[PDB]
Design a protein around this ligand. Sequence first.
Ligand SMILES: *[C@H]1OC[C@@H](O[C@@H]2OC[C@@H](O)[C@H](O)[C@H]2O)[C@H](O)[C@H]1F
Length: 206
Amino acid sequence: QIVTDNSIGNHDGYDYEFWKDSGGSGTMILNHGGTFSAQWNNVNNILFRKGKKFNETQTHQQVGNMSINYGANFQPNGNAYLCVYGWTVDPLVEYYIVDSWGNWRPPGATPKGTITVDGGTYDIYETLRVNQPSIKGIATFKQYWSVRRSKRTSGTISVSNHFRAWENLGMNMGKMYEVALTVEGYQSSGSANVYSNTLRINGNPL
Ligand SMILES: *[C@H]1OC[C@@H](O[C@@H]2OC[C@@H](O)[C@H](O)[C@H]2O)[C@H](O)[C@H]1F
């Protein structure tokens, strides 16, 4: 259950993944249920996550309501995100619902709107990745974002409400590929202890 290089699998019912590009190091310890700890040092880009991977046949509406209850001790030293993250396919989209960050509030673009949900206010953004790594090879794809206006590191994220807001703004979504509580680091070091992470689909825990 010690993961220090790229790996995808299932641990205690959750689909976990460790992903990094070259350089630096990271360690992910897979703990009970959706929980895990992460540490990273001198990386270029690293992501640690536990959630659900899907078989690319259903819209978010067809999967049903997705909600994540979480808590994490988030200790970045530099740039990092604490978020819900995942992908759709057809179209290929990477997405983020960011509740906390390190020194830099992402994603550096002009907001397209705002959503109020889960006691917070989130700015909504759309950015572009050109010829970058993806779940479907080197690709050009949009990134969709909801970013909280102030940081928090525990609570509930009503994922499907974000998806409805994005679609209302014309941020087209494809078939679900993944939804997961994620820690991302960029050109930084840090640690995170995700001590609570429960994904419920239609009110039922994974
Ligand atoms: C958002 O997160 C990092 C990266 O996505 C990874 O692409 C490679 C794939 O194997 C992993 O599962 C993904 O996390 C993407 O370039 C970036 F936009």
